[PDB]
């Protein structure tokens, strides 16, 4: 583990501004911290005033006054210091953090492939960078305002409180730790639980995910439900541990408000007590015990900042490790003689060199290449050959042990390698296209060039393509957002890149297989030109391209064999603004949706009433004893202070048990709503044909991310927001019906502001989260492209264009900073305007009481209570609100899992219009006149009305060019697509109104790439028929062949097999596909071309589990390979969608000579 740099390094990249933000935010910070309990103590003056001179109405009217001042400018102080703090520290942090990461990018750039190679993974670096956008910003920007105002509070409010009554500041000191405590327990009870439900969530899309990738094996035979049942179990699971969640979650809130009751009790009773012996005022005791809970509390919510900083610490600590490393390979040297001479006569003597990672093994060991001056050479080196690590040596990514390596007879040490590099020219395996516009990813071959030299390179040794048929053009920022590129347009953009570097030599090496002839009569008229251009890691290729290079000197065994003619060649490389009603209408039906549960919601429903009438009692209660506080007859104070406190404990007991029975209830409900939807969800996206499958949005991991996504925020949309609108409801009830019947005058006046107060507390609690955003969503761009750097560092590093990705990234990062700047501001403007706007309705509330006192409207008591009963229940509603608030992206949830039910599948795949089946049909499969085009490709039409057919009981192979869909056949005969048009009959029925699940369990089906259903190799192969038992599969692998290997495996049929269990043999693989295609006992087989890519023995192996797999019954096989289509007894022909030849292979090669099968002989020979 590596050792985290101290705090104070974290600020290195600290200027004078950045100092002088700091300060300020330091500053406010601890003013905005301090000012809180300064507040306390203003109003326990003013409240001690107000009720002390009620006999003499002008003393209390002025004081009175005095005090509102005093509250009005608390206000304003809280409003500038919270404004500096906020804006400061982002600010600040940001500033910071962007520099350290464009420093941090440009150490990278320029260190050593060798570097990478070894010392850290290039995921590590990307990983880095994530971490040093997060960790550190958010120690430095956030999490130090936070420490500084939090320890600023926990002074203040314990110096405050001491100064004023030290004897009740210690009791309210030792109920601190009680509350603090559960609050704690709480909280980690819940994030464990959590952690639980998150894993659990994730092995439900783990199986949405695989049911996707294997919708075709699962729709064609009978999986959807034993998909769901898998999906079933998951969710079960989830929301078992999403109930232990919900009553840990209410068990928390009821102890804390237990705990609560019970303190508070004791401590009224107690200042009770005080105030009776005259030690003390009512006012003052209030504000002692309010001021000493809030220290407490400021110190537990510092706490996670001293977290953070330490993640932070070994954060910046591997990113300066990163950032101060020195490259090896010296770089801007001195020694290069700068030669015009481009043309490199012979190079590449004596080399030794050994990888740098291992020393054990090399590969350059002892053997010379050399090159002539203008001529180019192809290099085939079997396959794992070190073919690369020539061109590396040569572009002096490495270098060569202690030895002889030259270059142009100057060496390569002593020629320098900012301009070396400049005179070669390289073209990757994989073009790397970097996220700029594609005409900057011109330039950076040569900064220098004008817009006439790229246009012209672009256009004399490139076709006009896509660059100039488009939108933009030369702006045509690609990005992640890039358009379409299929490979052609980057290659041929990577090759006209390469040509801007005009002069010596170029390399070459392999490209994709499936390419266009383009690109490749580019490259060979760019090696033409360029004559230099040598070291073509062609490995057996283009053979046009062989014969044009003078030595096609090859590296066998990472070694030169041969050096000269390359004439034969012979037995050697042979490898080739939004709605509401609707809103409304989708709520009402969810609700209805939630139906069976309604009993818990219910009494749910019930528990949070009673929840928000215990904070409002509460509420009272303090206002109550503080009224009792300013009372002389103290035998009376006595009374209402026991009866108030004993009622309190009393009431402890219910907040508990209903704060526990209402999260559990709703929580329930939740959970019990979120499986429903989550089903209903997967049974629709199953019902629907491979059609939708095949669309955008809809496959692999993006659909299991949108069924995952889409049902969290469904439970709280429901549950959280009915459960709040209740208990909220009760609590504003209560609480304005004590105020009203106190006196209505004062309460009408407060609940005027009562929600600039609700809102003020709520973004207390939000300041408290933190008010920076996503902080990785705000540097997406820049991440991105220092992804692509970092990725393509062999790539950067040949063109020599460090500085310009530098300055690409820097201007990708600057509106993230204007954006921060901007965001900090209006974030501290808006908070200090909204807590000035809460004092100033206190200080207007409570003069306007001392105003009605003054006028004998009313008493102290009444006003007091009033005012203290709406100000702690509008604070206990804003904690209310303080409950997830995903309202929005609920209901917007709400229409994405509503649209995805309400979609109607053109392919039904159950049969409601049933049609009779035969026990075992036959099968006379007859696709006479199918007219299909391709749906992902509709004007490609594999099928063009091809009457093909194939007698029941016999077996027809598919054969013909790859490019017309022979397999497409199949897909027809599932009913995958549906044919452009035709009509084709199955066994005297047309499979249009036949039933479509009768005709599944008859067909059987093996994919070109068997799919790995689940852990035993024995649930594969029962996957084949819905009752396989355990004989029939028995007699599944026998005839199979499949128990050959089965009995040599440790486990057998129990063996874990998949992604991250024993991976077998293709060979393997596609012999069980085979035995569970055999399981299902089906009369039609579509046997598809699943041998592919197999060494011998297992290529004899497969072939001769299809020779059993088709025996028997009948099959419709397609293939592209001899000895396969040998055995069938009728063949077709699938030129151009049509039938040309229909008949055996040797009835049909005696006859019509010359024929397509004779075609395909004379190829394969
Ligand atoms: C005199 C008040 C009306 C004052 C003007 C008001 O603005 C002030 O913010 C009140 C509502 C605060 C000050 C101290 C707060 C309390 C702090 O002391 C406590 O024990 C905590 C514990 C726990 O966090 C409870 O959920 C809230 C609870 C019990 C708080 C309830 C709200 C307060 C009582």
Same mark, same amino acid.
């Given at each position: *583990?590596?050792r985290?740099?101290?705090?104070?390094?974290?600020?290195?990249?600290?200027?004078?501004?950045?100092?002088?933000?700091?300060?300020?935010?330091?500053?406010?910070?601890?003013?905005?911290?301090?000012?809180?309990?300064?507040?306390?103590?203003?109003?326990?003056?003013?409240?001690?005033?107000?009720?002390?001179?009620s006999?003499?109405?002008?003393?209390?009217?002025?004081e009175?006054?005095?005090?509102?001042?005093?509250?009005?400018?608390?206000?304003?102080?809280? %409003?500038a210091?919270?404004?500096?703090?906020?804006?400061? %520290?982002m600010?600040?942090?940001?500033?910071?953090?962007?520099?350290?990461?464009?420093?941090?990018?440009? #150490?990278?750039?320029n260190?050593?492939?060798?570097?990478?190679?070894?010392?850290?993974?290039?995921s590590?670096?990307?990983? #880095?960078?994530?971490t040093?956008?997060?960790?550190v910003?958010?120690?430095?920007?956030?999490?130090? =305002?936070?420490?500084? +105002?939090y320890?600023?509070?926990?002074?203040?409010?314990?110096?405050?409180? $001491?100064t004023?009554?030290?004897?009740?500041?210690?009791?309210?000191?030792?109920?601190?730790?009680?509350?603090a405590?559960?609050?704690?327990?709480?909280?980690?009870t819940?994030?464990?639980?959590?952690?639980?439900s998150?894993?659990?969530?994730?092995?439900?899309?783990?199986?949405? *995910?695989?049911?996707? &990738?294997?919708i075709?094996?699962?729709?064609?035979?009978?999986?959807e439900?034993?998909?769901?049942?898998?999906?079933?179990?998951?969710?079960?699971?989830?929301?078992?541990?999403?109930?232990?969640?919900?009553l840990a979650?209410?068990?928390?809130?009821?102890?804390?408000? $237990?705990?609560? $009751?019970?303190?508070?009790?004791?401590?009224?009773?107690?200042?009770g007590?005080?105030?009776?012996?005259?030690?003390?005022?009512?006012?003052?005791?209030?504000?002692?015990?309010?001021?000493?809970?809030?220290?407490?509390?400021?110190?537990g919510?510092?706490?996670?900042?001293?977290?953070?900083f330490?993640?932070?610490?070994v954060?910046?600590?591997?990113?300066?490790?990163?950032?101060?490393?020195?490259?090896?390979?010296?770089?801007?040297?001195?020694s290069?003689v *700068?030669?015009?001479? &481009?043309?490199?006569?012979?190079?590449?003597?004596?080399?030794?060199?050994?990888?740098?990672?291992?020393?054990?093994?090399?590969?350059?060991?002892?053997?010379?290449?050399?090159?002539?001056?203008?001529?180019?050479?192809?290099?085939? =080196?079997?396959?794992?050959?070190?073919?690369?690590?020539?061109?590396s040596?040569?572009?002096?990514?490495?270098?060569?042990?202690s030895?002889?390596?030259?270059?142009?007879?100057?060496d390569?040490?002593?020629?320098?390698?900012?301009?070396?590099?400049?005179?070669?020219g390289?073209?990757?395996?994989?073009?790397?296209?970097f996220?700029?516009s594609?005409?900057?990813?011109?330039?950076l071959?040569?900064?220098? #060039?004008?817009?006439?030299?790229?246009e012209?390179?672009?256009?004399?040794?490139?076709?006009?393509?896509?660059?100039?048929?488009?939108?933009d053009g030369?702006?045509?920022?690609?990005?992640?957002?890039?358009?379409?590129?299929?490979?052609?347009?980057?290659?041929?953009?990577?090759?006209?890149?390469?040509?801007?570097?005009?002069?010596?030599?170029?390399?070459?090496?392999?490209?994709?297989?499936?390419?266009?002839?383009?690109?490749?009569?580019?490259?060979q008229?760019?090696?033409?030109?360029?004559?230099?251009?040598?070291?073509?890691?062609?490995?057996?290729h283009?053979?046009?391209?062989?014969?044009?290079?003078?030595? &096609?000197?090859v590296?066998?065994? =990472?070694?030169?064999s041969?050096?000269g003619?390359?004439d034969?060649?012979?037995?050697?490389?042979?490898? =080739?603004?939004?709605?509401?009603?609707?809103?409304?209408?989708?709520?009402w039906?969810?609700?209805?949706?939630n139906?069976p549960?309604?009993?818990?919601?219910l009494?749910?429903?019930?528990?949070?009433?009673?929840c928000?009438?215990?904070?409002?009692?509460?509420?009272?209660?303090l206002?109550?004893?503080?009224?009792?506080?300013?009372?002389?007859?103290?035998?009376y104070?006595?009374?209402?202070?026991?009866?108030?406190?004993?009622?309190?404990?009393?009431?402890?007991?219910?907040?508990?048990?209903?704060?526990?029975?209402?999260?559990?209830? %709703?929580?329930?409900?939740?959970?019990?709503?979120?499986?429903?939807?989550?089903?209903?969800?997967?049974?629709?996206?199953?019902?629907?044909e491979?059609?939708?499958?095949?669309?955008?949005?809809?496959?692999?991991?993006?659909?299991?991310?949108?069924?995952?996504?889409?049902?969290?925020?469904?439970?709280?949309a429901?549950?959280?927001?009915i459960?709040?609108?209740?208990?909220?409801?009760?609590?504003?009830?209560?609480?304005?019906?004590?105020?009203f019947?106190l006196? %209505?005058?004062?309460?009408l006046?407060?609940?005027?502001?009562?929600?600039v107060?609700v809102?003020?507390?709520?973004?207390?609690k939000?300041?408290?989260?933190?008010?920076?955003?996503?902080?990785?969503?705000?540097?997406?761009k /820049?991440?991105?492209?220092?992804?692509?750097?970092?990725?393509?560092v062999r790539?950067?590093?040949?063109?020599?264009?460090?500085?310009?990705?530098?300055?690409?990234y820097?201007?990708?990062?600057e509106?993230?900073?204007?954006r921060?700047?901007?965001?900090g501001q209006?974030?501290?403007?808006?908070?200090?305007?909204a807590?000035?706007?809460?004092?100033?309705?206190?200080?207007?509330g409570?003069?306007?009481?001392?105003?009605?006192?003054?006028?004998?409207?009313?008493?102290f008591?009444?006003?007091?209570?009033?005012?203290?009963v709406?100000?702690?229940?509008?604070?206990?509603?804003?904690?209310?609100?303080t409950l997830?608030?995903?309202?929005?992206?609920?209901?917007?949830?709400?229409? @994405?899992?509503?649209?995805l039910?309400?979609?109607?599948?053109?392919?039904?795949?159950?049969?409601?219009?049933?049609?009779?089946?035969?026990?075992?049909?036959?099968?006379?499969? *007859?696709?006479?006149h199918?007219?299909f085009?391709?749906?992902?490709?509709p004007?490609?039409?594999? $099928?063009?009305?091809?009457?093909?057919?194939?007698?029941?009981?016999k077996?027809?192979?598919?054969?013909?060019?790859?490019?017309?869909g022979?397999?497409?056949?199949?897909?027809?005969?599932?009913?995958?697509?549906?044919?452009?048009?035709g009509?084709?009959?199955?066994?005297?029925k047309?499979?249009?109104?036949?039933?479509?699940?009768?005709?599944?369990?008859?067909?059987?089906?093996?994919?070109?790439?068997?799919?790995?259903?689940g852990?035993?190799?024995?649930?594969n192969?029962?996957?084949? +028929?819905?009752?396989?038992?355990?004989?029939?599969?028995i007699?599944?692998?026998?005839?199979?062949?499949?128990?050959?290997?089965?009995?040599?495996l440790?486990?057998?049929?129990?063996?874990?097999?998949?992604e991250?269990?024993?991976?077998?043999?293709g060979?393997?693989?596609?012999?069980?596909?085979?035995?569970?295609?055999?399981?299902?006992?089906?009369?039609?087989?579509l046997?598809?071309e699943?041998?592919?890519?197999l060494?011998?023995?297992?290529?004899?192996?497969?072939?001769?589990?299809?020779?059993?797999?088709?025996?028997?019954?009948?099959?419709?096989?397609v293939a +592209?390979?001899?000895?396969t289509?040998?055995?069938?007894?009728?063949?077709?022909?699938?030129?151009d969608?049509? &039938?040309?030849?229909? /008949?055996? +292979? @040797?009835?049909?090669?005696?006859?019509?000579?010359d024929?397509?099968?004779?075609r395909?002989i004379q190829?394969?020979?």
């Amino acid at each position: *583990e590596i050792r985290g740099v101290a705090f104070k390094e974290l600020f290195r990249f600290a200027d004078g501004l950045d100092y002088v933000l700091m300060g300020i935010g330091s500053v406010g910070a601890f003013v905005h911290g301090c000012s809180l309990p300064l507040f306390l103590r203003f109003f326990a003056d003013l409240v001690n005033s107000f009720g002390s001179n009620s006999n003499n109405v002008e003393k209390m009217m002025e004081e009175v006054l005095k005090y509102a001042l005093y509250f009005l400018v608390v206000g304003a102080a809280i %409003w500038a210091s919270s404004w500096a703090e906020i804006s400061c %520290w982002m600010w600040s942090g940001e500033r910071q953090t962007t520099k350290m990461r464009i420093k941090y990018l440009e #150490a990278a750039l320029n260190q050593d492939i060798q570097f990478f190679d070894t010392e850290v993974r290039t995921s590590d670096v990307v990983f #880095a960078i994530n971490t040093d956008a997060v960790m550190v910003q958010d120690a430095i920007s956030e999490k130090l =305002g936070n420490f500084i +105002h939090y320890m600023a509070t926990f002074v203040s409010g314990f110096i405050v409180g $001491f100064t004023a009554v030290w004897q009740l500041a210690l009791v309210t000191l030792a109920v601190v730790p009680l509350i603090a405590v559960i609050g704690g327990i709480h909280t980690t009870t819940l994030s464990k639980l959590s952690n639980k439900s998150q894993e659990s969530l994730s092995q439900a899309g783990n199986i949405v *995910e695989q049911t996707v &990738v294997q919708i075709r094996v699962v729709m064609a035979f009978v999986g959807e439900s034993r998909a769901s049942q898998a999906y079933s179990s998951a969710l079960k699971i989830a929301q078992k541990l999403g109930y232990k969640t919900g009553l840990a979650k209410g068990m928390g809130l009821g102890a804390t408000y $237990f705990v609560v $009751f019970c303190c508070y009790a004791l401590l009224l009773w107690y200042g009770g007590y005080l105030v009776r012996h005259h030690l003390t005022n009512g006012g003052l005791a209030i504000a002692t015990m309010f001021a000493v809970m809030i220290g407490g509390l400021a110190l537990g919510q510092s706490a996670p900042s001293m977290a953070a900083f330490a993640k932070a610490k070994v954060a910046a600590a591997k990113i300066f490790r990163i950032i101060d490393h020195k490259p090896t390979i010296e770089r801007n040297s001195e020694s290069g003689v *700068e030669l015009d001479s &481009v043309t490199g006569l012979v190079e590449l003597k004596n080399v030794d060199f050994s990888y740098p990672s291992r020393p054990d093994v090399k590969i350059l060991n002892n053997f010379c290449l050399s090159v002539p001056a203008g001529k180019t050479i192809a290099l085939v =080196g079997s396959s794992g050959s070190g073919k690369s690590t020539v061109v590396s040596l040569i572009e002096r990514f490495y270098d060569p042990n202690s030895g002889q390596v030259l270059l142009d007879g100057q060496d390569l040490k002593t020629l320098k390698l900012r301009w070396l590099r400049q005179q070669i020219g390289l073209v990757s395996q994989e073009p790397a296209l970097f996220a700029t516009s594609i005409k900057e990813n011109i330039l950076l071959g040569r900064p220098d #060039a004008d817009q006439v030299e790229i246009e012209e390179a672009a256009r004399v040794a490139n076709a006009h393509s896509f660059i100039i048929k488009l939108p933009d053009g030369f702006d045509t920022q690609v990005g992640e957002r890039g358009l379409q590129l299929s490979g052609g347009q980057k290659q041929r953009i990577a090759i006209a890149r390469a040509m801007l570097k005009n002069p010596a030599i170029l390399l070459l090496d392999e490209a994709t297989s499936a390419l266009d002839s383009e690109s490749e009569k580019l490259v060979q008229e760019a090696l033409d030109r360029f004559m230099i251009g040598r070291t073509t890691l062609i490995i057996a290729h283009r053979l046009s391209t062989i014969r044009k290079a003078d030595l &096609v000197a090859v590296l066998q065994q =990472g070694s030169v064999s041969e050096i000269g003619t390359h004439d034969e060649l012979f037995s050697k490389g042979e490898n =080739g603004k939004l709605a509401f009603k609707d809103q409304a209408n989708s709520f009402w039906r969810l609700a209805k949706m939630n139906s069976p549960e309604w009993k818990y919601a219910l009494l749910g429903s019930v528990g949070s009433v009673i929840c928000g009438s215990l904070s409002a009692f509460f509420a009272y209660v303090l206002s109550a004893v503080l009224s009792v506080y300013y009372n002389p007859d103290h035998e009376y104070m006595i009374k209402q202070i026991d009866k108030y406190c004993y009622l309190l404990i009393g009431l402890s007991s219910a907040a508990l048990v209903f704060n526990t029975l209402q999260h559990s209830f %709703w929580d329930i409900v939740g959970e019990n709503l979120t499986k429903r939807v989550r089903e209903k969800m997967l049974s629709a996206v199953l019902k629907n044909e491979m059609a939708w499958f095949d669309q955008e949005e809809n496959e692999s991991a993006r659909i299991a991310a949108r069924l995952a996504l889409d049902a969290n925020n469904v439970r709280s949309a429901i549950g959280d927001r009915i459960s709040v609108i209740v208990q909220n409801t009760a609590l504003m009830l209560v609480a304005c019906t004590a105020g009203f019947v106190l006196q %209505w005058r004062l309460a009408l006046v407060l609940v005027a502001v009562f929600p600039v107060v609700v809102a003020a507390t709520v973004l207390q609690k939000m300041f408290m989260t933190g008010f920076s955003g996503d902080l990785e969503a705000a540097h997406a761009k /820049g991440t991105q492209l220092a992804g692509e750097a970092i990725a393509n560092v062999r790539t950067v590093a040949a063109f020599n264009s460090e500085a310009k990705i530098v300055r690409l990234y820097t201007a990708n990062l600057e509106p993230p900073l204007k954006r921060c700047f901007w965001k900090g501001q209006i974030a501290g403007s808006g908070y200090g305007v909204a807590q000035f706007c809460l004092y100033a309705s206190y200080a207007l509330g409570l003069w306007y009481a001392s105003w009605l006192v003054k006028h004998g409207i009313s008493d102290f008591s009444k006003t007091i209570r009033v005012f203290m009963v709406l100000m702690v229940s509008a604070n206990g509603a804003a904690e209310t609100l303080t409950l997830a608030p995903d309202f929005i992206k609920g209901g917007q949830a709400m229409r @994405s899992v509503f649209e995805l039910l309400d979609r109607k599948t053109e392919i039904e795949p159950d049969d409601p219009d049933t049609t009779p089946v035969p026990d075992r049909l036959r099968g006379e499969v *007859e696709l006479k006149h199918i007219d299909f085009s391709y749906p992902s490709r509709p004007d490609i039409q594999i $099928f063009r009305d091809l009457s093909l057919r194939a007698r029941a009981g016999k077996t027809l192979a598919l054969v013909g060019p790859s490019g017309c869909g022979k397999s497409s056949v199949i897909s027809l005969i599932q009913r995958f697509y549906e044919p452009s048009s035709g009509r084709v009959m199955i066994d005297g029925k047309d499979i249009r109104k036949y039933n479509l699940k009768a005709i599944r369990k008859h067909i059987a089906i093996v994919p070109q790439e068997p799919c790995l259903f689940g852990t035993t190799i024995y649930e594969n192969i029962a996957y084949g +028929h819905e009752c396989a038992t355990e004989a029939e599969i028995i007699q599944a692998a026998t005839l199979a062949s499949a128990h050959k290997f089965i009995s040599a495996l440790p486990e057998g049929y129990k063996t874990y097999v998949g992604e991250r269990g024993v991976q077998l043999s293709g060979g393997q693989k596609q012999r069980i596909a085979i035995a569970r295609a055999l399981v299902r006992k089906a009369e039609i087989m579509l046997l598809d071309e699943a041998t592919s890519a197999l060494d011998a023995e297992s290529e004899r192996s497969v072939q001769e589990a299809l020779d059993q797999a088709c025996s028997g019954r009948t099959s419709i096989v397609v293939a +592209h390979r001899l000895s396969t289509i040998r055995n069938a007894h009728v063949i077709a022909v699938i030129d151009d969608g049509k &039938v040309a030849e229909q /008949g055996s +292979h @040797s009835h049909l090669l005696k006859n019509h000579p010359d024929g397509i099968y004779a075609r395909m002989i004379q190829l394969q020979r």
